[PDB]
Amino acid sequence: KFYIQEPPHGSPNWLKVGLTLGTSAFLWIYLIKQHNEDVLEYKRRN
Amino acid sequence: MNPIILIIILMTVMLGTIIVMISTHWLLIWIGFEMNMLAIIPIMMKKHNPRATEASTKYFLTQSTASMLLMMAIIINLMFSGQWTVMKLFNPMASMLMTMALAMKLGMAPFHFWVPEVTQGIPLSSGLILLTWQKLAPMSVLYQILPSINLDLILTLSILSITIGGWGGLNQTQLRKIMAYSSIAHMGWMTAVLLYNPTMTLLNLIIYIIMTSTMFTLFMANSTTTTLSLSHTWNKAPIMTILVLITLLSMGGLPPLSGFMPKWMIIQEMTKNDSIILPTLMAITALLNLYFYMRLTYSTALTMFPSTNNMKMKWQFPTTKRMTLLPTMTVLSTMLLPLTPILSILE
Amino acid sequence: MTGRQARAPLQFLPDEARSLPPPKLTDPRLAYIGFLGYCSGLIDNAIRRRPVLSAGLHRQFLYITSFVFVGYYLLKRQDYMYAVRDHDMFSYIKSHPEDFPEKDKKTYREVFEEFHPVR
Amino acid sequence: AKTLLHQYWDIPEGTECHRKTYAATSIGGASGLVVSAYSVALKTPTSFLEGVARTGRYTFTAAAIGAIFGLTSCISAQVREKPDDPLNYLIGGCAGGLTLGARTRSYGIGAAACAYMGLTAALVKMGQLEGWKVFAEPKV
Amino acid sequence: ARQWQPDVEWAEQYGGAVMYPTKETAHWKPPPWNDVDPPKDTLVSNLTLNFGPQ
Amino acid sequence: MMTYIVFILSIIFVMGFVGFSSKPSPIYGGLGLIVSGGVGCGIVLNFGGSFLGLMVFLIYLGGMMVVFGYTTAMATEQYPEVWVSNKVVLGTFITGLLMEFLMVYYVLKDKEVEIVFKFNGMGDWVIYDTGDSGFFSEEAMGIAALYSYGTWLVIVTGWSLLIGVVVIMEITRGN
Amino acid sequence: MNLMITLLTNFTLATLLVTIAFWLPQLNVYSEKTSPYECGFDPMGSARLPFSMKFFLVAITFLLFDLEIALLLPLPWASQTTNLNTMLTMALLLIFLLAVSLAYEWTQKGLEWTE
Amino acid sequence: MSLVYMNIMMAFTVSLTGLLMYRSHLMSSLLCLEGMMLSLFILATLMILNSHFTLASMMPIILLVFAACEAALGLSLLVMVSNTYGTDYVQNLNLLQC
């Protein structure tokens, strides 16, 4: 439809978006874990 | 130009500056400087022309004799008090020669005559990586041996580099000599705080490196050497216009934008001493290094110059280049006014 | 200033950074960081000639996550540096009594001022 | 050198006249030799005789500046005898600027030289009499 | 469009070697665009030897 | 009779090396340079260093060999300059030798020379080793520490020399 | 300075050979012998003429491997230490790096042109 | 004080000025850089030898191997210079103007 000889993209890859969302969900999980540890650490030392 | 080979050579640039960062033996600092020079030669001369040849020649002579002057300084240090510790020196003579060797290295106003030349002919990746590493690495050593420097040297070279970088910038209608004189101006403001509180100097260093990274990325996006090409990049792409606007205005250092967080904090931790007339003369010349930014942005977007056709032809083909990292460094460089208590991240 | 844990220089947060409160949820500075990540992703979609607020929503998520994570560690460093500065200051205050004299802050019934009016 | 500009400041005000003027000529000649050394270093005067001629011209003008400034400084301090006000050195800097304009035989550049040099010299007196430091504390 | 736009003479001001000319300004030449000057030849060629009679 | 022989070798060193530094043609420059390198090797050999000076004479020599090859290759005149050929080179050589003999005068027949430091003008048998029991000729072990303790140092040395090799290769190749 | 004594005696030997060459035997009639000979033809200009060279890499290669000779020469004194395996490791790394440099410019045909 | 120290500093200063002002040859410049290297070498060696600073006597050998490979770099660049011209004076350097 309507193109000539090349989509350089347009049908997006199924590698990079899955990898970036996977590591970004990993980073959100780890930061929530960090902040919970920090609240526990403050109320532990005091 | 195998990419294995270029990854090797830039890894040696990495290794040279890491050796300069890591070591307390003076020979290792001198070796790191030399290795940085050795690897930074063939990043240039990827061209064939004698432009790159003679520019690398000038760079070689100036940078090599500055390194040998540094070795002279370390030798007079050990004719005096015998230690290989990077610490307070024990000679005004050796500190004089050492600061002048670093002054030839990173460029001061009596010593900058290789800088517009060496940026005049080289390609843009070469200029980017030499400006970033070759202006980061001597400032580490200056931070290391700050408490034993005769103040007249640093201060006079700083004032003179600011006023020469302001004065010479008014004429050059290329891009790279404008960028070189801007480098001189920022190195003047980086050196000028070194005897008072060096956290400001290293913050000035990081923000200047981010500004230059954005600048050279926005000159890699378009093969530009004069303002005429900048007018054609007005007529080919709209977002480049306002990005050149905001980045050149932050090169000027205006308060709502984020080129002001260096200057203002420097004036703070400068005028908490009783030097006032000299910082306000510095800041008036820092007003003066801004008119060539203004005529540049005038030529880019604030006016509309006539463009040649075949931009009709260029409209079909998008700017599908590589960018190093354009937007992240851009908005980290431009919207970072209210995070001034992220001064103390650096210390 | 100079460390004051100039022993582990790369120690980005020491054991002494476990005593002050961590940066809370929806603090205004980390909110501004997330806003900058949102604007960063907007202008990144503006670069590559792709539609704004469209087809880069995963990049919106990634940029916002990256900046919020970085700014989280930066805020923790900020709080540690200002806490150790305040503690060192107060130790040097308590250390020397006689060198920091408390003036007799007298009241204004006898503290004279020259006036020099305007007419 | 710090020693002979210290000799210039350490002339009391007071009158040790013709010696204040000799020190002012020495400062002007030193400054002229600086400027002339650079300007012959970056011109290749073609030839060496013309280089001596150019350095003689620049040191000649700068020594004239130093002489005329020292003379009008001493004359003002003898006539009015008030070391407090910088108006004597204001007259001094404007006299030096007008005589620089005389040595170049242009008039507008000489007038701007009068204005800028008068203000800067009166400022130097004003800050030294008020007491401002030489460039630094360097402490905090 | 009655909104004035700058012109070819503004461009010729803003184009060239340097901005402000002097009495020396002819020597600064307009620099090339590939940064390579193609014509360069001054005949640095072969050298003779008379490997001769005896 | 003579005692200042290390200082006299230094004087000969400075004479030949200043006539080197006055820049005549590199043929004569290399002649004065190898004269200076040999007598500097004599200085450091007579001072106490066993092999290091003869070593550096060898290395420095080979460098001057390659320098001579390239000055035959590239920089040739219709008639090259000597010290006594041109006005400027002759003036520089006479003035440098003049400053040398003037320093000789102020050291010999006077007390103190204070150009950059108050240099104590007397003979260099002081200071010196007071007969300490070496038994292993100190500088031999002083270089032998390079492979014992010298872990990081020769790593960066050999790495930079490998980079030097590939750098020369790519700059020559880049035509 | 015993070597200096011997060097002085050999220089006096060389000067007596110079003087017995020039002064003593016979005369020195001039006016054509001073001409430069090539094969029977007076050449163009003279020598000291710009002479290009073939090798470009080999001389600098000589220079760098002479410097690496200089690094390698305290192998005899190194051979008596308590840290033997470290000495062996760094020495093998030095020669292995040297041979890597040689074989690199050997496979990248650095020596396959006008040697 | 050991008067050889002052004399080698004298030779240093003169070789430095010879490296700075120079008539036309790049070759003489590289040559006098190599000379000033040798001067700094001999001075540092006599320092260490008076000190009995036997532990880190890596300074002479490593100082000079690094500075001689700098000279090797310079000879490569002089090869490129004399390749793109016939004469390599101060003339045929005036392009790429300041």
From Swiss-Prot, chain B:
Topology of this chain in the membrane: Multi-pass membrane protein
Role description: Core subunit of the mitochondrial membrane respiratory chain NADH dehydrogenase (Complex I) which catalyzes electron transfer from NADH through the respiratory chain, using ubiquinone as an electron acceptor. Essential for the catalytic activity and assembly of complex I.
UniProt GO BP: mitochondrial electron transport, NADH to ubiquinone; mitochondrial respiratory chain complex I assembly; reactive oxygen species metabolic process
Cleavable signal peptide: none
Protein name (database record): NADH-ubiquinone oxidoreductase chain 2
Pfam families: NADH_dehy_S2_C, Proton_antipo_M
PANTHER family from the UniProt entry: NADH-UBIQUINONE OXIDOREDUCTASE CHAIN 2
Upper classification of the organism: Eukaryota, Metazoa, Chordata, Craniata, Vertebrata
Enzyme Commission number, as recorded: 7.1.1.2
Protein's UniProt keywords contain Electron transport: yes
Transmembrane segments annotated in the record for this chain: 3-23, 25-45, 67-87, 96-116, 122-142, 145-165, 178-198, 200-220, 237-257, 274-294, 325-345
GO CC aspect terms: mitochondrial inner membrane; respiratory chain complex I
Organism: Ovis aries (Sheep)
Recorded family membership: Belongs to the complex I subunit 2 family.
Annotated catalysed reactions: a ubiquinone + NADH + 5 H(+)(in) = a ubiquinol + NAD(+) + 4 H(+)(out)
Main location: mitochondrion
Entry keywords, A to Z: Electron transport, Membrane, Mitochondrion, Mitochondrion inner membrane, NAD, Respiratory chain, Translocase, Transmembrane, Transmembrane helix, Transport, Ubiquinone
Subunit-level organization: Core subunit of respiratory chain NADH dehydrogenase (Complex I) which is composed of 45 different subunits. Interacts with TMEM242.
Subcellular location: Mitochondrion inner membrane
Keyword hit for Lipid metabolism: no
UniProtKB/Swiss-Prot annotation, chain F:
TM spans (from-to): 1-21, 25-45, 47-67, 88-108, 149-169
A GO BP annotation: mitochondrial electron transport, NADH to ubiquinone
E.C. number(s) listed in UniProt: 7.1.1.2
Pfam families for this protein: Oxidored_q3
Gene3D superfamilies given in the database record: NADH-ubiquinone/plastoquinone oxidoreductase chain 6, subunit NuoJ
Subcellular location: Mitochondrion inner membrane
Protein name: NADH-ubiquinone oxidoreductase chain 6
UniProtKB/Swiss-Prot annotation, chain G:
Catalytic activity, as annotated: a ubiquinone + NADH + 5 H(+)(in) = a ubiquinol + NAD(+) + 4 H(+)(out)
Family: Belongs to the complex I subunit 3 family.
Principal subcellular localisation of the protein: mitochondrion
Function: Core subunit of the mitochondrial membrane respiratory chain NADH dehydrogenase (Complex I) which catalyzes electron transfer from NADH through the respiratory chain, using ubiquinone as an electron acceptor. Essential for the catalytic activity of complex I.
Pfam families for the chain: Oxidored_q4
InterPro entries according to UniProt: NADH_UbQ/plastoQ_OxRdtase_su3, NDAH_ubi_oxred_su3_sf
Cross-referenced PANTHER family: NADH-UBIQUINONE OXIDOREDUCTASE CHAIN 3 (PTHR11058:SF9)
GO BP of this protein: mitochondrial electron transport, NADH to ubiquinone
Its membrane topology: Multi-pass membrane protein
Keywords linked to the UniProt accession: Electron transport, Membrane, Mitochondrion, Mitochondrion inner membrane, NAD, Respiratory chain, Translocase, Transmembrane, Transmembrane helix, Transport, Ubiquinone
Cellular compartment(s): Mitochondrion inner membrane
Membrane spanning residue stretches: 3-23, 55-75, 84-104
Gene Ontology MF: a single term: NADH dehydrogenase (ubiquinone) activity
Gene assigned in the entry: MT-ND3
Species whose genome carries this gene: Ovis aries (Sheep)
Known partners and oligomeric status: Core subunit of respiratory chain NADH dehydrogenase (Complex I) which is composed of 45 different subunits. Interacts with TMEM186. Interacts with TMEM242.
Name of the featured protein: NADH-ubiquinone oxidoreductase chain 3
Its EC number(s): 7.1.1.2
GO CC annotation: mitochondrial inner membrane; respiratory chain complex I
Top-rank taxon, per record: Eukaryota
Swiss-Prot record, chain H:
Coiled-coil stretches noted in the UniProt entry, renumbered to this chain: none
Main location: mitochondrion
GO molecular function terms noted in the UniProt entry: NADH dehydrogenase (ubiquinone) activity
Keywords noted in UniProt: Electron transport, Membrane, Mitochondrion, Mitochondrion inner membrane, NAD, Respiratory chain, Translocase, Transmembrane, Transmembrane helix, Transport, Ubiquinone
Subcellular location: Mitochondrion inner membrane
Single Gene Ontology BP annotation: ATP synthesis coupled electron transport
Catalytic activity: a ubiquinone + NADH + 5 H(+)(in) = a ubiquinol + NAD(+) + 4 H(+)(out)
Function: Core subunit of the mitochondrial membrane respiratory chain NADH dehydrogenase (Complex I) which catalyzes electron transfer from NADH through the respiratory chain, using ubiquinone as an electron acceptor. Part of the enzyme membrane arm which is embedded in the lipid bilayer and involved in proton translocation.
Protein name: NADH-ubiquinone oxidoreductase chain 4L
Organism of origin: Ovis aries
